[PDB]
């Protein structure tokens, strides 16, 4: 005769007997069986600090920060070069309050030096050798019957 044996609650709620039953919900859900989402933005205005916009979700919320701030609740100020966004040992230079510039190392390119420049366009791999791109170079993956740097030996 346990009413909780049927498992009436959902989304992490704990069933407890009382007189029928009750579902003790986690803070992210509410209602008789924890099936309705709590709007965190509505319960605490200014949840996303420094003029951030709160967006409610099923089981959580997300903060949309303005360019000048960062963090889960837009609390940490945005510094263009700390943490540094440039990839592959690239040097970061700030150009403004929110804009930045990456000085790429030879071989890399793009806004944040994330793209490796393809060195295969003018490759000299012969006899069906496949050009494999590297950092400022390339190597030919030769078929089994051919050897050498350009698949000629
Ligand atoms: Ca509701
Ligand atoms: Ca929510
Ligand atoms: Ca390359």
Numbering used by the authors: 141 to 159, 161 to 294
Quote the original article.
The Notch receptor is a key component of a core metazoan signaling pathway activated by Delta/Serrate/Lag-2 ligands expressed on an adjacent cell.
We report a crystal structure of EGF4-7, where the domain interface formed between the non-Ca2+-binding domain, EGF6, and its preceding domain introduces a bent conformation to the region. Each domain within the construct displayed a canonical EGF fold, with a single Ca2+ bound, as expected, to EGF5 and EGF7 (Handford et al., 1991, Mayhew et al., 1992, Rees et al., 1988). An unusual tilt angle of ∼80°–90° was observed at the domain interface of EGF5 and EGF6 for both crystal forms resulting in a bent conformation for this stretch of EGF domains. The EGF5-6 domain interface is stabilized in this orientation by packing of the side chain of A208 (with some contribution of T209) in EGF5 with V239 from EGF6. A second packing interaction is also evident between Y219 and P221 at the N terminus of EGF6. The EGF4-5 and EGF6-7 pairs adopt a more elongated conformation than observed for EGF5-EGF6, but these pairs are not as elongated as the previously determined structure for EGF11-13.
